[PDB]
Design a protein around this motif. Structure first.
Motif, mmCIF file in Angstrom:
data_model
loop_
_atom_site.group_PDB
_atom_site.id
_atom_site.type_symbol
_atom_site.label_atom_id
_atom_site.label_comp_id
_atom_site.label_asym_id
_atom_site.label_seq_id
_atom_site.Cartn_x
_atom_site.Cartn_y
_atom_site.Cartn_z
ATOM 1 N N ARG A 1 0.800 -1.225 0.000
ATOM 2 C CA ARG A 1 0.000 0.000 0.000
ATOM 3 C C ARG A 1 0.846 1.296 0.000
ATOM 4 N NH1 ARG A 1 -3.004 -0.827 5.488
ATOM 5 N NH2 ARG A 1 -1.899 -2.443 6.671
ATOM 6 N N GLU A 2 2.040 1.238 0.595
ATOM 7 C CA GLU A 2 2.937 2.390 0.724
ATOM 8 C C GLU A 2 4.398 1.947 0.505
ATOM 9 O OE1 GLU A 2 3.858 2.561 5.614
ATOM 10 O OE2 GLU A 2 2.732 4.213 4.574
ATOM 11 N N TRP A 3 5.248 2.886 0.113
ATOM 12 C CA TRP A 3 6.623 2.528 -0.258
ATOM 13 C C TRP A 3 7.657 3.539 0.235
ATOM 14 C CZ3 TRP A 3 2.455 2.782 -3.519
ATOM 15 C CH2 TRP A 3 1.851 1.546 -3.833
ATOM 16 N N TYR A 4 8.859 3.043 0.513
ATOM 17 C CA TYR A 4 9.912 3.834 1.146
ATOM 18 C C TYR A 4 11.208 3.887 0.339
ATOM 19 C CZ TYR A 4 7.058 3.940 5.373
ATOM 20 O OH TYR A 4 6.051 4.181 6.305
ATOM 21 N N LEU B 1 3.400 16.172 -0.260
ATOM 22 C CA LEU B 1 3.332 16.600 -1.651
ATOM 23 C C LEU B 1 2.258 15.830 -2.403
ATOM 24 C CD1 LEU B 1 7.153 16.208 -1.700
ATOM 25 C CD2 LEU B 1 6.150 18.419 -2.253
ATOM 26 N N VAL B 2 1.821 16.387 -3.525
ATOM 27 C CA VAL B 2 0.896 15.707 -4.416
ATOM 28 C C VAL B 2 1.451 15.833 -5.810
ATOM 29 C CG1 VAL B 2 -1.560 15.251 -4.365
ATOM 30 C CG2 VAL B 2 -0.692 17.339 -3.291
ATOM 31 N N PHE B 3 1.456 14.723 -6.540
ATOM 32 C CA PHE B 3 1.960 14.764 -7.894
ATOM 33 C C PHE B 3 0.917 15.334 -8.841
ATOM 34 C CE2 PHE B 3 3.219 13.075 -12.057
ATOM 35 C CZ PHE B 3 4.559 13.445 -12.101
ATOM 36 N N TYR B 4 1.405 16.097 -9.808
ATOM 37 C CA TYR B 4 0.622 16.601 -10.917
ATOM 38 C C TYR B 4 1.322 16.132 -12.170
ATOM 39 C CZ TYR B 4 -1.961 19.776 -7.930
ATOM 40 O OH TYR B 4 -2.834 20.314 -7.012
ATOM 41 N N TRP C 1 -1.372 10.365 -6.194
ATOM 42 C CA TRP C 1 -0.111 9.961 -5.612
ATOM 43 C C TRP C 1 0.338 10.961 -4.567
ATOM 44 C CZ3 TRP C 1 1.854 5.188 -6.331
ATOM 45 C CH2 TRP C 1 1.394 4.460 -7.438
ATOM 46 N N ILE C 2 0.597 10.460 -3.373
ATOM 47 C CA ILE C 2 1.074 11.309 -2.308
ATOM 48 C C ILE C 2 2.484 10.906 -1.885
ATOM 49 C CG2 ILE C 2 0.570 12.266 -0.030
ATOM 50 C CD1 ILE C 2 -1.477 12.714 -2.336
ATOM 51 N N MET C 3 3.228 11.882 -1.386
ATOM 52 C CA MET C 3 4.573 11.645 -0.907
ATOM 53 C C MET C 3 4.866 12.473 0.353
ATOM 54 S SD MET C 3 8.120 11.945 -2.978
ATOM 55 C CE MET C 3 7.657 10.376 -3.678
ATOM 56 N N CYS D 1 11.751 9.248 1.577
ATOM 57 C CA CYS D 1 10.395 9.466 1.088
ATOM 58 C C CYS D 1 9.465 8.251 1.278
ATOM 59 C CB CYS D 1 10.446 9.807 -0.408
ATOM 60 S SG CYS D 1 11.201 11.417 -0.809
ATOM 61 N N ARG D 2 8.227 8.533 1.671
ATOM 62 C CA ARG D 2 7.182 7.523 1.736
ATOM 63 C C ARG D 2 6.129 7.836 0.681
ATOM 64 N NH1 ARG D 2 4.940 8.973 6.409
ATOM 65 N NH2 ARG D 2 5.442 7.195 7.767
ATOM 66 N N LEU D 3 5.942 6.920 -0.262
ATOM 67 C CA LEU D 3 5.009 7.137 -1.361
ATOM 68 C C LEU D 3 3.776 6.248 -1.253
ATOM 69 C CD1 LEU D 3 4.660 8.269 -4.516
ATOM 70 C CD2 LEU D 3 5.392 5.928 -4.984
ATOM 71 N N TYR D 4 2.674 6.698 -1.844
ATOM 72 C CA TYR D 4 1.438 5.926 -1.841
ATOM 73 C C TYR D 4 0.305 6.645 -2.569
ATOM 74 C CZ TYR D 4 -0.474 8.917 1.844
ATOM 75 O OH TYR D 4 -0.951 9.985 2.566
ATOM 76 N N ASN D 5 -0.642 5.867 -3.082
ATOM 77 C CA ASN D 5 -1.802 6.412 -3.775
ATOM 78 C C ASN D 5 -2.997 6.511 -2.834
ATOM 79 O OD1 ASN D 5 -4.134 6.370 -6.040
ATOM 80 N ND2 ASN D 5 -2.170 6.895 -6.988
#
Lengths: 146, 146
Positions: free
Chosen positions: B61-64, B105-108, B120-122, B139-143
């Motif tokens: 669900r989330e990534w590092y 952050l939010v990706f665009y 996508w959030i970071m 960084c921790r990433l996830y949708n």
């Protein structure tokens, strides 16, 4: 607090709904050994939520108990107050014909309906005709303003 | 996915902010052995977020990731798009004179300002004059719609 008896930093108990039901609630209702003995057993609905972390076997922000009770109902009387359903039973469907049900509650200190909302939240997890008995539910407790 | 190389069910990587900074980011910037080698190293800001889980060493669900970069800024260009700050730097203050900073952050996808918000959030975690270098962020990433 005894999830402290093993792990590398940043690792802790943070199960999914499928995991709580499948390897914890399920096993307790089937009389199977738990993967680890970390869930405290208490007569939970006899308590006020702030007297509960007591009492738990581990945890700082959230707590896990095996208690007697449910089998679907808005509400659940407890302590010097009551719990109020915050949503609908939510199906939790592990691999087998196993079927769990989680429901979310909020404590109100006081007798109904003149009770006052607290920030104590609870997720009750019951075996909802899964398969394995009545009899045990598995609850996760915590305060909103941690 | 290799947090799979040890643990009892319902146990997984779910660190606090103090833990991420103290035992992961801190150690990498001090050239200390990590408590476990689970954080993937990538040139993250060269990527589109959906190409990132690739690529991570574990997680569903989330990534590092450990990536090169920051040292405070609304935004961070990346891939075929950009990240946009979703809040303010948030102090993360472990025990020592150690000081971290998390920002969200939010990706665009698209070039500014004609970019379109994705789910996508970071969380970027940087050593913000702690002590231990520039140089690495974590960084921790996830949708949002997992």
């Amino acid at each position: 607090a005894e999830a402290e008896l093993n792990l590398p930093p940043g690792f802790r108990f943070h199960p999914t709904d499928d995991e709580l039901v499948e390897h914890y609630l399920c096993r307790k209702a089937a009389g199977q050994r738990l993967p680890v003995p970390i869930i405290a057993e208490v007569d939970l609905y006899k308590f006020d939520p702030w007297d509960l972390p007591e009492r738990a076997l581990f945890g700082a922000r959230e707590w896990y108990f095996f208690t007697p009770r449910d089998r679907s109902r808005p509400n659940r009387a407890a302590g010097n107050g009551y719990w109020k359903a915050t949503g609908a039973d939510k199906p939790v469907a592990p691999r087998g014909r196993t079927l769990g049900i989680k429901k979310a509650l909020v404590f109100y200190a006081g007798k109904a309906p003149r009770g006052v909302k607290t920030d104590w939240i609870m997720h009750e997890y019951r075996l909802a005709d899964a398969g394995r008995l009545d009899d045990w539910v598995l609850c996760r407790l915590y305060n909103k303003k941690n």
